[PDB]
Structure 1
C-alpha cells in the first residue's frame, strides 16, 4: 500500500526549494494517480490529489469516460466558486510571484492539513492546493508538475504570466470529500 505521510518524510528529508518540492511530490503521485500522463481528466486528478493529502488513500483517478460518474455533480455543487473572477494576475507578474500571491489567499483562508481544489481559468484545467501549516504545496498529479497554468512543459519561476490569467480557489467541504469516499465511483478506482 501507499502512505502519504511517509512520502512527505522522504521529501522533507531533502532540502529542496518550494517549487522544486511540489514538482517532485506531484511527479510521485502522478505515477500512481494518472499512470498514463494523458489529458482530459485533470478535474479527477486534482480531486484525487486532495483525497490522498487528506488521508483517504491513493487511487487511480478516473479516465475521461469515467469523469461523468462523479465529477459532473462536483462541478455543479461548486458552480458558484468556479464561475467567478478569482485571483487575476498582475501585468508583468512572474510565475513565482503569481504563485506566491495565490498561496497567500489560501493560507489566509485554510488551516494546516487542509486541501483545496484549484481551477485554472474557470475549470479549463485543475490542480490541488495543500496547506502544511507554513507553505502551500500546489500539485498537478495529471502531468506530474507543481504549480502551472495548463502548461505543456513546466515554466520557469521567472516566466511572465499572460495578461489577466485567472485562478479560482475552490473551497470543498469535508461533507463533499466524504460523499466521494462513500461513492462507488471512488471505490471502483484502483488502489495505489
Structure 2
C-alpha cells in the first residue's frame, strides 16, 4: 500500500541510471496495474500509468475484454494525434539516442508533474510518459519495463532502433483524465 508518489523517491535517487530507474518503477507498478500480464491491454495499462502519476491511484488495468469499455472512445477521440507520422528514428540511431531525442516533444511541451500517452507505431503499442521536472520517465507497466518499442525483452541502452521506428506522443487533456475517473469503467477496476 505504498501508494501515491510516496515511493516516488524510494525508486528515484540511488546508484541507478536514467534509462535504468525507468524499468525500475515500471516493474513495481506492473505488479499492481497488470498482475501477471502481457496481452493487448497495453492501451489500458498506459492510461492507468498516467492515472497513478497524476495522483488518482493505482488500479488493476482493464483486460482485453474490457478495453472497449473506455479505450475504444479514447481512440475514437485522440485518433488524429495517432494517425500522425510523429517522431521517427534516423538510420543507425541507438535506443538511448532515440529515447533522449523523443524526450523533447515532451520536456518542451510539458508541465510540473504532467503525463502523456505515447503511441508506438500508431496504436501498435503504448507506454506512459511522465515529466518529473528535469528529465522524463517512460513506463510500460504492462510488461514492467522502461521505454521500449514493443520488444519481448527490454533492449540494451545502445542497441539499434529498427528502421523507420515511429512514436506519436499523445497530449491528453486533464478533462479526459477527469472524464475517465468519473466513468464506470474506472470505478469498477479493482483498486490496488
TM-score relative to the length of structure 1: 0.98
Are the counterparts in 2 of residues 2 and 58 from structure 1 also a CA contact under 8 Å? no
**Structure 1 unmatched ranges of 5 or more:** none
Instruction: Please identify runs of 4+ aligned residues in structure 1 that moved more than 4 A.
Output: none
Aligned residues between the structures: 192
Name the CA distance, whole Å, in 1 between partners of 2:4 and 2:148.
22
Deviations 1:18-74 (A, max 9, x none): 011010100000000000222110000000000000000000000000000000000
Distance change in 2, residues 1:38/1:155 (3 Å): same
Name the CA distance, whole Å, in 1 between partners of 2:9 and 2:129.
19
Aligned to 1:59: 59
Deviations 1:115-171 (A, max 9, x none): 000000000000000000000000000000000000010000110001111000000
RMSD (CA atoms): 0.8
* SS, match of residue 168 in structure 1: strand
1:14 Cα deviation from its structure 2 partner: 1.9
1:185 Cα deviation from its structure 2 partner: 0.3
Aligned to 1:3: 3
Aligned to 1:40: 40
Are the counterparts in 2 of residues 129 and 136 from structure 1 also a CA contact under 8 Å? yes
Name the CA distance, whole Å, in 2 between partners of 1:87 and 1:15.
31
Structure number with higher helix proportion: 1
Name the CA distance, whole Å, in 2 between partners of 1:112 and 1:91.
33
**Structure 2 unmatched ranges of 5 or more:** none
